[PDB]
Amino acid sequence: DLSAASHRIPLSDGNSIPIIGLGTYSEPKSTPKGACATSVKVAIDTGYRHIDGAYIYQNEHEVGEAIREKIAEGKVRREDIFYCGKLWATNHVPEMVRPTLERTLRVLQLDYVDLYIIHVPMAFKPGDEIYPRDENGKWLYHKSNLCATWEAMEACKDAGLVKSLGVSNFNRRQLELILNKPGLKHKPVSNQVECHPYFTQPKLLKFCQQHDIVITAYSPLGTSRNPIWVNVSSPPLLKDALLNSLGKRYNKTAAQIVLRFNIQRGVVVIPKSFNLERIKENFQIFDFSLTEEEMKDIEALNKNVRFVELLMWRDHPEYPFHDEY
Numbered sequence: 001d002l003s004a005a006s007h008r009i010p011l012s013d014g015n016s017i018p019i020i021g022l023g024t025y026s027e028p029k030s031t032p033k034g035a036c037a038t039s040v041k042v043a044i045d046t047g048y049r050h051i052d053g054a055y056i057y058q059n060e061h062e063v064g065e066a067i068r069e070k071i072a073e074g075k076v077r078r079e080d081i082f083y084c085g086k087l088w089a090t091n092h093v094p095e096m097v098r099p100t101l102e103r104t105l106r107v108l109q110l111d112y113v114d115l116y117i118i119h120v121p122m123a124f125k126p127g128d129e130i131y132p133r134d135e136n137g138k139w140l141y142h143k144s145n146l147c148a149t150w151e152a153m154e155a156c157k158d159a160g161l162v163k164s165l166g167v168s169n170f171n172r173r174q175l176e177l178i179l180n181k182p183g184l185k186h187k188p189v190s191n192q193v194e195c196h197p198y199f200t201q202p203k204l205l206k207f208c209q210q211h212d213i214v215i216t217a218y219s220p221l222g223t224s225r226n227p228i229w230v231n232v233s234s235p236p237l238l239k240d241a242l243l244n245s246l247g248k249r250y251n252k253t254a255a256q257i258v259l260r261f262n263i264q265r266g267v268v269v270i271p272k273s274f275n276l277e278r279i280k281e282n283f284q285i286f287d288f289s290l291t292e293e294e295m296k297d298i299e300a301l302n303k304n305v306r307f308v309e310l311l312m313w314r315d316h317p318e319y320p321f322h323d324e325y
């Protein structure tokens with residue numbers, strides 16, 4: 001049911017999401033200006049119709065540049081492209097939600113985004129700093145009020161500024177807070193969380209499926225393994241014996257096997273590459289399918305261990321990763 005030309009899956013609000021997208025986080029210091037724009041253009045040329053971004057990635061203007069250029073030349077219509085943006089922790093104050101989205105729209109120079117999600121359930125102190133800490137290094141936590149933040153998100157959809165609403169890094173409890181909200185108008189259609197063969201999110205996926213919430217797998221290739229923020233204790237995902245062995249069987253790379261695995265089970269994948277060859281490689285996942293025994297074997301690689309633990313925030317009242325799921 002999935003092809004290179006047609007691979008959108010339904011969202012609960014009547015919209016749909018391309019099952020693969022291009023991730024666009026890249027370390028600002030070691031990334032050349034323009035690398036993002038070029039990559040988004042190459043991805044669109046390749047067949048990608050979903051781009052995942054965020055204002056705090058510092059390159060949203062490049063994403064917009066690329067999308068607008070492809071629209072202007074007639075490669076795609078605006079309706080053909082799915083862009084997901086994110087509301088950061090320092091912008092959870094309800095009154096800040098719409099102005100924050102409007103900033104992203106102005107940066108993209110677009111009229112709406114397709115998906116706008118709460119980036120993390122944790123709120124930080126509002127201000128000109130993305131990661132607010134005092135001189136002692138104490139993370140300055142703001143008293144999160146997720147339902148009130150969600151209400152402001154809902155107003156953005158009502159205004160037509162965003163087609164679909166979702167969340168990211170939310171656990172079952174936090175999803176329930178929203179789903180059980182008094183006078184809920186728009187349920188979350190998507191939860192973006194780390195997902196791949198070493199962390200297949202069995203319980204969270206089951207829960208989301210029961211509530212018609214689609215999981216988007218961030219870091220679907222196991223991350224860039226930057227130790228400065230990534231847990232590099234586990235061996236590199238793409239070096240796995242089974243994944244590489246299966247790769248040989250299908251003449252595909254471990255990366256391609258890993259992406260096929262998640263999309264085959266209805267999980268959206270947003271691998272990031274700013275490399276011409278790898279952008280194309282990651283998209284070539286519609287010309288084969290894994291056997292049910294292969295899916296089981298891959299799903300059995302499940303470590304129930306995370307590459308992205310964000311331990312520095314483990315004591316925040318809204319830290320998502322203390323609960324089971």
Ligand SMILES: NC(=O)c1ccc[n+]([C@@H]2O[C@H](COP(=O)([O-])OP(=O)(O)OC[C@H]3O[C@@H](n4cnc5c(N)ncnc54)[C@H](OP(=O)(O)O)[C@@H]3O)[C@@H](O)[C@H]2O)c1
Nearest residue numbers: 023024025218219220221222223224255271272273274275
């Ligand atoms: N919501 C959240 O909290 C959250 C958290 C993390 C990420 N995200 C989103 O998810 C996107 C992807 O996650 P991610 O960037 O952290 O990690 P990832 O997509 O799992 O892996 C990215 C790394 O893999 C490399 N790579 C890409 N394709 C490859 C291939 N075929 N073979 C070998 N290496 C390959 C990339 O380098 P090259 O670019 O040089 O190819 C990069 O170093 C992010 O960009 C961001 O959009 C969201």
Ligand SMILES: C[C@]12CC[C@H](O)C[C@@H]1CC[C@@H]1[C@@H]2CC[C@]2(C)[C@@H](O)CC[C@@H]12
Nearest residue numbers: 025026054056057119131218228229310
């Ligand atoms: C922005 C990222 C990555 C993309 C993802 O969408 C969200 C995370 C949150 C934690 C960031 C990390 C990037 C690297 C940071 C800034 C480290 O220097 C300290 C905390 C990390």
Ligand SMILES: [Cl-]
Nearest residue numbers: 055086087088
């Ligand atoms: Cl933001």
